[PDB]
Design a binder for this molecule. Structure first.
Ligand code: HEM
Ligand SMILES: [Xe]
Ligand SMILES: [Xe]
Ligand SMILES: [Xe]
Ligand SMILES: [Xe]
Length: 153
């Protein structure tokens, strides 16, 4: 369980992401696909992209990144009271997309890396620890829903 102070560290960096969610999403996807290329294979619409240049130029990838970060932002804004928000996401990611918890760990890593790079003013050590705790909680709760849904993750 995060403290209110921890949630505020999470929300204060998220406020900066929201200056330009699209640009943040592009950086996060590029980082994910570069660091863990296997994750790109899960994307029917994007697995053909060969280079960072192609990734940057993809309007559909940009739009997907906006969807991801906005869905995650809504979850973070619930400050742990995210049962309703997690249900459709867990179901689609377990059953349609088939995304293991390991890959959620990878995207969490990419999120942290991009925030660390872009936002040293709001992503010092305490803020990074708070964001890690929030993402760990997210993954814990997704993992529990995965198991309810019959997916080992
Ligand atoms: C922060 C964690 C993530 C969030 C909040 C998130 C959110 C979303 C949302 C909102 C959608 C569209 C609605 C849906 O189908 O549920 C989506 C689609 C999708 N997600 Fe995720 N996602 C996350 C992580 C991942 C990861 C790590 C992968 C694969 C490695 C993945 C694979 C996909 C795929 C393949 C789609 C369909 C994309 C398309 O329309 O072409 N997701 N995700
Ligand atoms: Xe993203
Ligand atoms: Xe997810
Ligand atoms: Xe995550
Ligand atoms: Xe969360």
């Amino acid at each position: 369980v995060l403290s209110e102070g921890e949630w505020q560290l999470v929300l204060h960096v998220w406020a900066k992401v929201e200056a330009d969610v699209a640009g943040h999403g592009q950086d996060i996807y590029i980082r994910l696909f570069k660091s863990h290329p296997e994750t790109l294979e899960k994307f029917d619409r994007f697995k053909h992209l060969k280079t960072e240049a192609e990734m940057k130029a993809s309007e559909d990838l940009k739009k997907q990144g906006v969807r991801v970060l906005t869905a995650l932002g809504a979850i973070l804004k619930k400050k742990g009271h995210h049962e309703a928000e997690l249900k459709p996401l867990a179901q689609s990611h377990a059953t349609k997309h088939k995304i293991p918890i390991k890959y959620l760990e990878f995207i969490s890593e990419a999120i942290i890396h991009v925030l660390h790079s872009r936002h040293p003013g709001d992503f010092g050590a305490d803020a990074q620890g708070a964001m890690n705790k929030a993402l760990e909680l997210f993954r814990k709760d997704i993992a529990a829903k995965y198991k309810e849904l019959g997916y080992q993750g």
